[PDB]
Ligand binder design. Structure first.
Ligand SMILES: [Mg+2]
Ligand SMILES: [Mg+2]
Lengths: 180, 364
C-alpha cells in the first residue's frame, strides 16, 4: 500500500518467575523489630548467580494492612540441549529430590540502610511446590505462599505472592527425562 | 530498510505489536507527530495527517470496523480525506480531531464517552457534531469512560462518566454530548486519568476533580467533599504548566519542579522506596537538576522527557513498559534514566495501561 508502516526484521523451553508482593502479619516479631527497616526477596536457581535472582530494590517493611510490590520478573532459558543441567535440576525438584523436598524456596531478607551484607538477616521463607504446577497443568498468577519463621519453618509471619509461568516447561521436562 | 535519520517509533510492554517484545517501526516518507496510548491501545498521528491505530479492539476502539485485536499499526483509511491532527485513547474509546473542524470518536460508549448522544458502542469513527471549525482543538484527552477537548482559545468541554465527579459536572451522573466545564478562566492543559481529571489554567493554576480516594486529587482533607467541582490545588506556589493523571496518581510540571501525589505502590510517584502515598503534592527531589519539558502517565507508571531529549521513567515495570530495555523487569521507585536511549533524542512519549510508545531520533 504505502499507507504501510515499515517494520525492520528482528516457550515451553523457558520459565518465568515473578516475585510480586508481600505483607507481614502485625503480630509477627519482624513487625516490632525496629532494626528491620526494609526487605528484599531472593531465591537460588541452579547455578545462576544470586545477584540475578534477588529483587533489585529493597522496600520499606510494610505496616499493618499494607502490601509492598516488587514485580520482579526473571525469564530463565531452559533450551532442551543448551540447558540440560537446569532441566535436570528441575526434574530432581519435581521428584522431591532436592534439600527443600520438591520446593523452590524464596527468602525474605532484611537489608540494613547501609546495605552491608554482613548485617543482612533472613526474616522468613516461603516454599513453592513445583509438582503442584505439573499436576494442576496450569500456572496460577499471584499464588500466595505463607512466609514462615526461620525459628521453626512453620509459624507464619506473612504472605508472599509469586507468579510462575512453568507448566508448559515442567511438562516438557518431565516427559523428556523419564524416557528420552 | 535503514532506520531513517528522522527516527522510529519504539513500543514497550503489551502493545499488541511484534508479539509484545520491544518493537520498532516507522513510516515511508512520513514521520510521527503525536502519540497517545489508552489502557490497551495506541494511536499515532503522522506529519502527513494520517492516523494509525493498534492494540486491543474488543470494544471497537481502533475505529477499523471490527472487534479483533490488530497486531500492526494500521492506517484509518476512512479518515484519509481529512487532515488528522490529534488523537486521545481512553480505557475503551478513542477521540480524533481534524484540521477541518470535525471531532470523531469510536469504541465503548456505556457512559456516553463517544459524545454521540446515546450509549451504543461504535467500531468505526463517528462524528461528534457539536464541534465545528469554530472549535480550534489544542488538546484531546480520554480516561476511563471520559472524554475532553480543549480549544486554542481556552474552552474545555468534557463528556462521558461523571459518577465520581471526574468530568467536573457536579451531581450529574454522566453526559452523552460535550458540555463546557468552565471555572471562568481560560484553560491551557487538561488530563483525564482513570477516575479523576485535572486541568491547568493559562495563568498557571491547577484544578483537580474526581474520585476522592488515594490522595490523588492532591487537596487538603476539608475540600474532598466538593470533589465533583474543579478545585484549586493551592499548595503548589509557582505557576503550573502541565498535569498528567494516571490510575491512582497525578504528576504536575511547574516552571520549578515536578510534583506527584496519590498512591504509588509500584513506584509511580518516584519518591523512593519508603513513601508510597501522599495526599498533598510533593516534589520529586530526585530529578531536581534536570529541566523537564514533558510529562506523561500510564495507569501505573510515569515518563518525563527532558529539554535535551533524555527520558526518565518510574513505576510499575511489568511487561517492560518502563521502556528501559532490560530483559528482567522490576518496579522502579525513583526516576530512572532510559539509558537504552542515550544515542537518541527522545521527542514524544505516551503511556498506557500495559505499554508505552516512544518516538526517538538517532544522534547519527
Ligand atoms: Mg499524608
Ligand atoms: Mg492495568
Amino acid at each position: 500500500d504505502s499507507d504501510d508502516v515499515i517494520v525492520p526484521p528482528m516457550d515451553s523451553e523457558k520459565m518465568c518467575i515473578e516475585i510480586v508482593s508481600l505483607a507481614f502479619y502485625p503480630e509477627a516479631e519482624v513487625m516490632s523489630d525496629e532494626n528491620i527497616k526494609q526487605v528484599y526477596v531472593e531465591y537460588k536457581f541452579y547455578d545462576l548467580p544470586l545477584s540475578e535472582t534477588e529483587t533489585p530494590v529493597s522496600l520499606r517493611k510494610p505496616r499493618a494492612g499494607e502490601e509492598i510490590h516488587f514485580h520482579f520478573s526473571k525469564v530463565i532459558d531452559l533450551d532442551p540441549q543448551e540447558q540440560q543441567g537446569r532441566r535436570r535440576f528441575l526434574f530432581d525438584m519435581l521428584n522431591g529430590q532436592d534439600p527443600d523436598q520438591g520446593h523452590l524456596k524464596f527468602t525474605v531478607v532484611s537489608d540494613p540502610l547501609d546495605e552491608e551484607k554482613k548485617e543482612c538477616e533472613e526474616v522468613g521463607y516461603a516454599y513453592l511446590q513445583l509438582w503442584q504446577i505439573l499436576e494442576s497443568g496450569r500456572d496460577i498468577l499471584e499464588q500466595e505462599l505463607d512466609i514462615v519463621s526461620p525459628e521453626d519453618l512453620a509459624t507464619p509471619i506473612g504472605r508472599l505472592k509469586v507468579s510462575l509461568q512453568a507448566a508448559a516447561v515442567l511438562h516438557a521436562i518431565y516427559k523428556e527425562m523419564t524416557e528420552d | 530498510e535503514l532506520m531513517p535519520d528522522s527516527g522510529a517509533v519504539f513500543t514497550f510492554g503489551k502493545s499488541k505489536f511484534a508479539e509484545n517484545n520491544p518493537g520498532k517501526f516507522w513510516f515511508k516518507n512520513d514521520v510521527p507527530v503525536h502519540l497517545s496510548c489508552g489502557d490497551e491501545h495506541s494511536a499515532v498521528v503522522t506529519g502527513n495527517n494520517k492516523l494509525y491505530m493498534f492494540g486491543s479492539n474488543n470494544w471497537g476502539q481502533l475505529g477499523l470496523g471490527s472487534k479483533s485485536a490488530i497486531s500492526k499499526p494500521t492506517c484509518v483509511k476512512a479518515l484519509k480525506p481529512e487532515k488528522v491532527k490529534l488523537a486521545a485513547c481512553g480505557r475503551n474509546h478513542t477521540l480524533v480531531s481534524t484540521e477541518g473542524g470535525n471531532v470523531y470518536a469510536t469504541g465503548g460508549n456505556n457512559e456516553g464517552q463517544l459524545g454521540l448522544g446515546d450509549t451504543e458502542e461504535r467500531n468505526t469513527f463517528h462524528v461528534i457534531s457539536f464541534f465545528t471549525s469554530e472549535h480550534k482543538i489544542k488538546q484531546l484527552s480520554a480516561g476511563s469512560n471520559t472524554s475532553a477537548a480543549l480549544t486554542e482559545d481556552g474552552r474545555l468541554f468534557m463528556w462521558g462518566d461523571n459518577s465520581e465527579g471526574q468530568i467536573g459536572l457536579k451531581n450529574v451522573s454522566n453526559v452523552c454530548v460535550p458540555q463546557q466545564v468552565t471555572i471562568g478562566k481560560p484553560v491551557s492543559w487538561v488530563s483525564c486519568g482513570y477516575y479523576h481529571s485535572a486541568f491547568v489554567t493559562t495563568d498557571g493554576e491547577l484544578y483537580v476533580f474526581g474520585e476522592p480516594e488515594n490522595g490523588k486529587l492532591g487537596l487538603p482533607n476539608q475540600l474532598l467533599g466538593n470533589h465533583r467541582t474543579p478545585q484549586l490545588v493551592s499548595e503548589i506556589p509557582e505557576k503550573v504548566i502541565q498535569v498528567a493523571c494516571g490510575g491512582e496518581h497525578t504528576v504536575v510540571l511547574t516552571e520549578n519542579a515536578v510534583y506527584t501525589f496519590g498512591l504509588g505502590q509500584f513506584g509511580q510517584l518516584g519518591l523512593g522506596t519508603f513513601l508510597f502515598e501522599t495526599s498533598e503534592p510533593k516534589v520529586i527531589e530526585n530529578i531536581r537538576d534536570q529541566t523537564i519539558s514533558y510529562i506523561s502517565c500510564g495507569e501505573n507508571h510515569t515518563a518525563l522527557i527532558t529539554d535535551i531529549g533524555l527520558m526518565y521513567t518510574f513505576g510499575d515495570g511489568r511487561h517492560g513498559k518502563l521502556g528501559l530495555g532490560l530483559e528482567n523487569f522490576t518496579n522502579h521507585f525513583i526516576p530512572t534514566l532510559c539509558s537504552n536511549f542515550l544515542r537518541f533524542i527522545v521527542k514524544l512519549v505516551a503511556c498506557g495501561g500495559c505499554h508505552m510508545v516512544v518516538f526517538a531520533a538517532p544522534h547519527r
